[PDB]
Design a protein around this ligand. Sequence first.
Ligand SMILES: CCCCCCCCCCCC[N+](C)(C)[O-]
Ligand SMILES: [Pr+3]
Length: 387
Amino acid sequence: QALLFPLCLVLYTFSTYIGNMMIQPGMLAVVEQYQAGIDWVPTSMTAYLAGGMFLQWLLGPLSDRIGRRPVMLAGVVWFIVTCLAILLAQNIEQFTLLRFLQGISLCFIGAVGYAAIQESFEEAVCIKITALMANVELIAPLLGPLVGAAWIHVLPWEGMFVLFAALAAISFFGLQRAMPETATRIGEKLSLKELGRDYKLVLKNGRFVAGALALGFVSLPLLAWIAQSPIIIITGEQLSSYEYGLLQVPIFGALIAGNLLLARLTSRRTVRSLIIMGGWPIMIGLLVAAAATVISSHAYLWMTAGLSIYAFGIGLANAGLVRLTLFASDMSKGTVSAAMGMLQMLIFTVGIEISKHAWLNGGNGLFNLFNLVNGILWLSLMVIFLK
Ligand SMILES: CCCCCCCCCCCC[N+](C)(C)[O-]
Ligand SMILES: [Pr+3]
């Protein structure tokens, strides 16, 4: 009867992903209008990322302290505001600011949004909702840059920010009068000292952190592409929206196929084996990705095909290694997730920034090398993590 409330959060989830996945393809348009250089294309994703790891930590225990409903709304409100208030910044210097504060609307999906389902809805109810909100995080980056390439053709870029403010409203007016709250730390002290100290406790876990990083480093070459896949292909390789959008699928369609097997071979195998099981393609992906752009700098096909091996592997391994890294520290679920979020993004954010220059002053070579760099990193944190 009240399954309309999960779907509202499903939508808010949906919008925040495409609100980054439809934007990166159409960032070129925005750069060639605000004027700065194609080096600002990825730097969209970057500022969108670096916002999510601002109050990531503080929103969890915070949405506990003063209700889940008013803080959640303060986010859906915060989203739609800066979804239309960025249309009236018009300069690239401060497009960032409004892109960055659109990225803080990311802590709201997990530290309170996801937490509201873990508090109210029960186990088997939570399963099918999370099985859903995992496909949102898979389909909205898969098919987003595909609508984001069929949106800059029939309309301008501006049409997206209206469409998101409105879709976040289709959820918001469905959450205006249909959002019950279940925060139990109402009327509690402004205890700020306790967070840092307790996050430093999961920071002291050389098995957890080294495992939390390895999650970042591994999933980075995936996000480093997404942020740079336009200016790699559109301006870098000089290809159209149907051709560049064609190359998003063989990659993603391989990530989906690795999430197909994972959920099927979760049974006949141990979690421990799966990571090493999905590791070989990851090794071979980033292996051959860059082992392509060795002498041939512009065989993007084999790079995209290499990021299809690597992609298949992230579906299996990366996903498994999530849980073990939650349970690598026998501590709170809220503190570990926030700790591994704020770590993964720090890898993502600052990883891309390095990934960017990697592409400029090096071209495609350096870039893929500063990909396999991360496969090496992750693997190097596996010789630690298991054996
Ligand atoms: C922020 C990028 C999320 C979409 C990419 C899907 C691959 C799984 C990455 C795991 C971390 C994602 N998250 C938001 C649950 O922390
Ligand atoms: Pr505590």
